[PDB]
Amino acid sequence: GSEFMDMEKRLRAEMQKAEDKAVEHKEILDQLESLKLENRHLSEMVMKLEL
Amino acid sequence: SEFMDMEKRLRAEMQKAEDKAVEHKEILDQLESLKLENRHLSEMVMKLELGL
Amino acid sequence: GSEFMDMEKRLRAEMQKAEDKAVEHKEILDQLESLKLENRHLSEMVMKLELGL
Amino acid sequence: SEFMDMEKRLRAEMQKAEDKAVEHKEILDQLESLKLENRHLSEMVMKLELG
Amino acid sequence: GSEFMDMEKRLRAEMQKAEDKAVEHKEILDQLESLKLENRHLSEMVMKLEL
Amino acid sequence: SEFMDMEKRLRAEMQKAEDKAVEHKEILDQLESLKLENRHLSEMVMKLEL
């Protein structure tokens, strides 16, 4: 019906909210790890150089 | 040490959000499962009272 | 004052936000009953028809 | 079981929303009750000072 | 580098909206403490006048 | 007394909000902290490469 339909379009949209905020957390996480990897990679470049 | 506390806090927060998205799917799916039983139960009724 | 009538607005908007979320939680829970109750009734009909009543 | 455990999860989240709406109404009521007796006191000061 | 910068702003937005809520709560605690102090001011005035 | 716990329940919610605002700044800080160390390291690689 109509009262039922408007409940599905909210429950679906409320879901992708939680599925969006989980992606934004994933965005922060493996962007920290990306900077972590560049840091080690640049550190080892420096080390291999002075060696 | 202090870097991998925030890192643990984020993943714990990320998982907390993931469960919410899954809790919504089980409610949105169990709804869809129940109406499917209606359409399949009401059809049984119609077929049955077509026979008499 | 006016700040005191800006905070009352913020509260009564915050409050109506909470009342609405509790209402949405009901219709989901209420509809999950009207559908579950309908299936017992629909099942009780399929039975009553096969028995020939 | 799958269906009736999520119903708990739903009811517990509903009351977790009602409890919030009650906590807000408690602030809005108690902050008006304060505002009320202040006028009720402000009048006694005026009534007393007039005689 | 660029998708990164949309995340920095999202983190900044959530930070401000958290500071806004911390300030909004402060006004709730401040107006309450302001009101009970006006009571004691008005209540003790009535008492002085009543003597 | 009924007034009392509300003021603590309200102050506690203020602390929960203050804490979240701090945690967001950490991520903003340690992010900007890492991108600074990564530029500083990148400069060392340039200077040393001669």
Author numbering:
A (entry chain C), E (entry chain E): -5 to -1, 440 to 485
B (entry chain B): -4 to -1, 440 to 487
C (entry chain A): -5 to -1, 440 to 487
D (entry chain F): -4 to -1, 440 to 486
F (entry chain D): -4 to -1, 440 to 485
Please give the exact wording used by the authors of the publication that reports this structure.
Comparative analysis of the Cep63 (462–483) region with the previously characterized GCN4 leucine-zipper dimer38 revealed their structural similarity, each showing pairwise hydrophobic interactions along its parallelly arranged dimer (right). Notably, three copies of the Cep63 (440–490) dimer were found in an asymmetric unit (left) within which two copies appeared to be from crystal-packing artifacts, judging from several lines of evidence. First, the data obtained from SAXS, sedimentation velocity/equilibrium, and iSCAMS analyses are all consistent with the dimeric form of Cep63 (440–541). Second, SEC-multi-angle light scattering (MALS) showed that Cep63 (440–490) is mainly (97.9%) in a dimeric state. Third, the L469A N473R V480K mutations designed to disrupt the parallelly arranged dimeric interactions yielded a delayed peak (12.82 mL) of the monomeric form, whereas the L445A A456K L463K mutations aimed at disrupting the predicted packing interactions did not. Fourth, the Cep63 N-terminus-in and C-terminus-out arrangement observed around a centriole does not support a tridirectional protein orientation that a hexameric Cep63 could adopt (left). Intriguingly, the Cep63 (440–490) fragment is highly acidic (pI approximately 5.5), raising the possibility that the open-ended N-termini of the Cep63 (440–490) dimer could interact with the conserved basic Cep152 (1273–1295) region (pI of 9.5) predicted to form a CC motif. If this were the case, then the Cep152 (1273–1295) region could substitute the packing interface observed in the Cep63 (440–490) crystal structure.
Using multidisciplinary approaches, we showed that two long coiled-coil proteins, Cep63 and Cep152, form a heterotetrameric building block that undergoes a stepwise formation into higher molecular weight complexes, ultimately generating a cylindrical architecture around a centriole. Remarkably, Cep63 and Cep152 can self-assemble into a radially aligned, submicrometer-scale, cylindrical structure in vitro in such a fashion that the N-termini of Cep63 and Cep152 are placed at the innermost and outermost regions, respectively, of the structure. Notably, the N-terminus of Cep63 (i.e., the mCherry fluorescence of Cep63) was detected in the innermost region (231 ± 23 nm in diameter), whereas the N-terminus of Cep152 (i.e., the mGFP fluorescence of Cep152) was positioned at the outermost region (350 ± 23 nm in diameter). These observations agree with the previously proposed model that Cep63 and Cep152 generate an antiparallel 2:2 heterotetrameric complex arranged around a centriole in the Cep152 N-terminus-outward fashion. Mutants defective in Cep63•Cep152 heterotetramer formation displayed crippled pericentriolar Cep152 organization, polo-like kinase 4 (Plk4) relocalization to the procentriole assembly site, and Plk4-mediated centriole duplication.
